[PDB]
Design a protein around this ligand. Structure first.
Ligand code: CA
Lengths: 266, 266, 266
């Protein structure tokens, strides 16, 4: 059933997606799921052992590799982590269903915790390029919603305070910030960046909030972690060259992947 | 002709809709129309004597009973109130046309007065669950408009001071506020609520402004009445539980319906 | 290939448009392009000699005359200015592709400079109807983007400082301001206008920022100039009558056409 055909039940496609994953990986259920965003592609390498790789295009509802990872905990029990292959942005024009399909598919596999990551611009000068930041809340500015009916979900604590405390048990120095989602793909003008600050954002980017909303609706607990690609337009007096942004991003690789691995164990 | 098809003239469907109503009800023209939002469902029981009921799905352009009520005034004169059967929200994705069809239809029956009610979240701590609030102005945050083409409607006084003054005759204590409309169906996070306050809203909800813009365009006089379902996210340190909100909503029922009934007679 | 079909490549239609123009006008390439907004219809009559007029509906992708003008410079050299036909607005419902097609056609003829003009509402009382204002930056509030993929374009200086310097050589008294685009077609309510000032806007309208984004993606230097049609709702304690607004705009005609004529020669 095509996800973009309005008559299709997106959750039925999620179910079929999960089933496909259960039999292609041999894992009956996953416990947590991760979405690797810009700057986070190598960040799942230290998480544990890869149990299976599933070309994403072969999973119902999508269209590079989805990974099933076994995570060893302190007490010897294990966890299965679903690492989603790639991510669909609103600016690709495929509709909001394709954007949150990965999240609904993860919840259908039985996952309870969702770790959303992204690359983004920061409005706070203390957080230079390469700095990871925990999301405390968000402002969705895309004028779009992933929910399609009379939906009763409370979004008072989208980003689980429980998980934010855990992250702080792992690294007490991570700051927290409100993230604003712009439709994109073009970046914000200095006036739009001042606008976001006046509205209460510390970070701007192009994803995550619709995924968080869909996660909550499916009852997932959410941990959001941004990597500041660099300071947003007009924030820095002397803005970083593109080469500099890339290098600062690279050099954050080890830290960032050690953080997800430690967090995945709790 | 399907309201859906871009070629179709929405106003001609509304014309057919009024003609059907006049014929099905026996009432050649209506004087006022009421749209009952969340929590206002039975608020039209004291309006007057039901003259007719029309299965809404049988009226051109719709797809629940629409009622024609005889309102009896002080000086024995009578008015006919059109109580529209259903309401189509923007978040259902049926297009902005289906959202304002009821308003354009009321205009075509010749009802010059439109009473728009809704349920919303309040930002003012003085207005707890159950408080009816008069709309003094609005902020449309849906990035949508019900008008197609070069239709330059002046929205300087969308909500008629004249009608607010009459509302104050029935209850001089009613407060007034600026309502902000988000696309929905989800509610706002505490950060979005704070943003709404910064922008100047006192109330947040998910309907009404598109309807109010189309009403003006048709030359209707509009009364907007919001029912605070409860304080919005992060406004109260002591949030009411879902059961309490429902209960508070039920208890306002009587007050609320006496209010419309009195306002309807003027 | 209809621009309308998602499959069509917009830029290929732009190429066709441009080859068509070069042929119909005999001008191999143009150097600059101008879009005349509301209040600017007669402001290109002093630009230079009209080399050719092309009915717009005849150029690939459009659907009321486009003109190729010869600009004689001080040193005896010449330039060819492409003066675009009307302008397609977002509120017309034909999609973002149709809105920025003129800009991409211009780029395709080789133009390196784009002058965008519009008529807008002002929020600064020091700028009465008739005041032309240079655009220093903008705030796009339509929740749309003309870019279709990971088009990672920098908007840190959408409105060229070079061009604002030159405009200032012609008339050093021109002020600069931040422009906010609303989808329209309805005008803003006094609450919405207050909202725009809180967000940092000095001017509100319904066009331009999408065209500006598409122009910068194509590498054009952009000059934006607004003509305040009048004060936005609630700004003026004393609202101008229609007669006044119209007369203020006509009184501005000479000043505006002289401005572009002088700028066009640099
Ligand atoms: Ca009448």
């Amino acid at each position: 059933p095509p996800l973009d055909d309005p008559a299709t039940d997106p959750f039925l496609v999620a179910r079929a997606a999960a089933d496909h994953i259960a039999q292609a990986t041999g894992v009956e259920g996953h416990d947590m799921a991760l979405v690797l965003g810009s700057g986070w592609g190598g960040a799942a390498e230290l998480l544990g052992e890869v149990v299976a790789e599933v070309p994403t295009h072969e999973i119902p509802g999508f269209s590079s590799v989805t990974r099933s990872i076994r995570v060893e905990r302190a007490d010897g029990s294990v966890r299965h982590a679903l690492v989603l292959g790639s991510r669909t942005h609103l600016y690709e024009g495929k509709g909001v269903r394709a954007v949150v399909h990965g999240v609904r598919t993860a919840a259908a596999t039985g996952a309870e915790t969702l770790i959303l990551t992204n690359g983004c611009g920061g409005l706070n000068q203390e957080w230079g390029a390469g700095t990871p930041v925990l999301l405390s809340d968000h402002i969705n500015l895309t004028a779009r919603s992933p929910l399609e009916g009379p939906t009763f979900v409370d979004l008072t604590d989208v980003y689980s305070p429980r998980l934010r405390e855990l992250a702080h048990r792992v690294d007490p120095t991570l700051p927290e910030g409100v993230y604003a989602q712009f439709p994109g793909p073009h970046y914000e003008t200095p006036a739009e960046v001042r606008m976001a600050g006046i509205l209460g954002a510390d970070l701007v980017g192009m994803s995550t909030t619709l995924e968080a909303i869909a996660a909550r609706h499916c009852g997932l607990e959410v941990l959001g972690v941004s990597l500041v690609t660099n300071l947003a337009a007009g924030i820095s007096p002397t803005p970083l060259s593109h080469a500099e942004v890339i290098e600062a991003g690279q050099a954050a690789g080890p830290r960032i992947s050690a953080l997800l691995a430690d967090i995945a164990k709790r």
